[PDB]
């Protein structure tokens, strides 16, 4: 703590406040996260600094002193939420959307292969730099330890306590649609409102499309029954390749939902390139 000179407060996270800080020693600029300490967390967090991938925000150090916990992450200047706000008028170019989705899927495939889940993916957690790269931040913290519910998977909202890697694919699918249309896909303001907004778009799930759904802890036979909408109306003007991938990312049944690995081979990415975005820092 004493070894860092806090510059600015980057923002309040799910498990603590994040500050832009300068390592008074090395002089390097980093992201200092003050965790708002169990031995389990310590061990879990420790394994995370071993995970290294170009599309994952690197956990540099873990400072456990005076019974306090500080996580030191690599620093990136902008998150996707701010970039989207800045591109509100023209929207993000499709080539850049495709590049970002491609890199994010690589990041997830890597984490998923190590059995590490994010569980709370959202625009605020996706950081970008001037080189055209995008990285996932806060990976694996959920397991170690006005909340947005917009990117929450159906199985989580229905009471399933043993979620899988599929929950991250759902969140990513929601973010994908948002970049294309420039509007949140399911902006619920409560757990039931979130669930109903999903049902009104993709249809109320039943035993046909999702075996075992009526046995979920929070499922109620009294749920209204809405018909499914066509994706052409939900995410215009995404082409057929894109709509195809999106539908596979938003399948109700977690077991039918596409994996990050398989999505990487989807036809939507046949013409992927790596454009450099115009960032205003
Ligand atoms: O560079 C960074 N590393 C991080 C590690 C974790 C988190 C985080 C998020 N929620 C909880 O934890 C964030 C970072 C991080 C931040 N850099 C950064 C730096 C500046 C700005 C933003 C983000 C947002 S903006 O409005 O675009 C300005």
From Swiss-Prot:
One Gene Ontology CC term in the entry: endosome
Key words of the record: Acetylation, ATP-binding, Cell cycle, Cell division, Cytoplasm, Cytoskeleton, DNA damage, DNA repair, Endosome, Kinase, Magnesium, Meiosis, Metal-binding, Mitosis, Nucleotide-binding, Nucleus, Phosphoprotein, S-nitrosylation, Serine/threonine-protein kinase, Transferase
Family matches, as InterPro entries: CDK (IPR050108), Kinase-like_dom_sf (IPR011009), Prot_kinase_dom (IPR000719), Protein_kinase_ATP_BS (IPR017441), Ser/Thr_kinase_AS (IPR008271)
Modified residues (N-acetylmethionine): 1
Binding, Mg(2+): 125, 138
Induction pattern: Induced transiently by TGFB1 at an early phase of TGFB1-mediated apoptosis.
Active site: 120 (proton acceptor)
Recorded GO MF terms: ATP binding; cyclin binding; cyclin-dependent protein kinase activity; cyclin-dependent protein serine/threonine kinase activity; magnesium ion binding; protein domain specific binding; protein serine kinase activity; protein serine/threonine kinase activity
Name of the featured protein: Cyclin-dependent kinase 2
């Amino acid at each position: 703590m004493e070894n860092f000179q806090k510059v600015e407060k980057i923002g309040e996270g799910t498990y603590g406040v994040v500050y832009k800080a300068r390592n008074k020693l090395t002089g390097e600029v980093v992201a200092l996260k003050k965790i708002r300490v169990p031995s389990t967390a310590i061990r879990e967090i420790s394994l995370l600094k071993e995970l290294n991938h170009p599309n994952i925000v690197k956990l540099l150090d873990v400072i456990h002193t005076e019974n306090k916990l500080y996580l030191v992450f690599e620093f990136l200047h902008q998150d996707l939420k701010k970039f989207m706000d800045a591109s509100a008028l023209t929207g993000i170019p499709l080539p850049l959307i495709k590049s970002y989705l491609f890199q994010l899927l690589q990041g997830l495939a890597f984490c998923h292969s190590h059995r590490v889940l994010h569980r709370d993916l959202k625009p605020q957690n996706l950081l970008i730099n001037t080189e055209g790269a995008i990285k996932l931040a806060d990976f694996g913290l959920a397991r170690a330890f006005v909340v947005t519910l917009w990117y929450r998977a159906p199985e989580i909202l229905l009471g399933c306590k043993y979620y899988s890697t599929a929950v991250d694919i759902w969140s990513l699918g929601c973010i994908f649609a948002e970049m294309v249309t420039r509007r949140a896909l399911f902006p619920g303001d409560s757990e039931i409102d979130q669930l109903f907004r999903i049902f009104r778009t993709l249809g109320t799930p039943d035993e046909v499309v999702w075996p075992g759904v009526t046995s979920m802890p929070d499922y109620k036979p009294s749920f209204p029954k809405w018909a499914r909408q066509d994706f052409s109306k939900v995410v215009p003007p995404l082409d057929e390749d894109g709509r195809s991938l999106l539908s596979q990312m938003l399948h109700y049944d977690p077991n039918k939902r596409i994996s990050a690995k398989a999505a990487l081979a989807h036809p939507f990415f046949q013409d992927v390139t790596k454009p450099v975005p115009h960032l205003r820092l």
